[PDB]
Symmetry: C2
Subunit: 51 residues, 2 copies
């Protein structure tokens, strides 16, 4: 159904919309979309490191 | 009644009001008030002057 490997699961949107309401009030909706690169953690163990 | 020699007959107003309506529309009402000095016309006759 909605879930599928070949179907996209979201929409890229990065635009700042300005909605002027009244009496000088402004609704500023800021959309931000970015592509993220994640890699394998050097270790899978939590570590107490001392500097 | 409303008319009187000692009563003022108007209000001095010289302010630019900004009324934001919506969708970014602005109603700019500009009030302007000035004191005017008028003197007697050098002549009371219409004149066809040639330069």
């Amino acid at each position: 159904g909605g879930g599928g490997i070949g179907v996209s699961t979201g929409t890229y949107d990065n635009q700042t919309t300005y909605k002027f309401l009244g009496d000088g009030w402004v609704e500023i909706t800021a959309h931000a979309s970015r592509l993220l690169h994640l890699g394998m953690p050097p270790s899978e163990n939590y570590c107490r490191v001392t500097v």
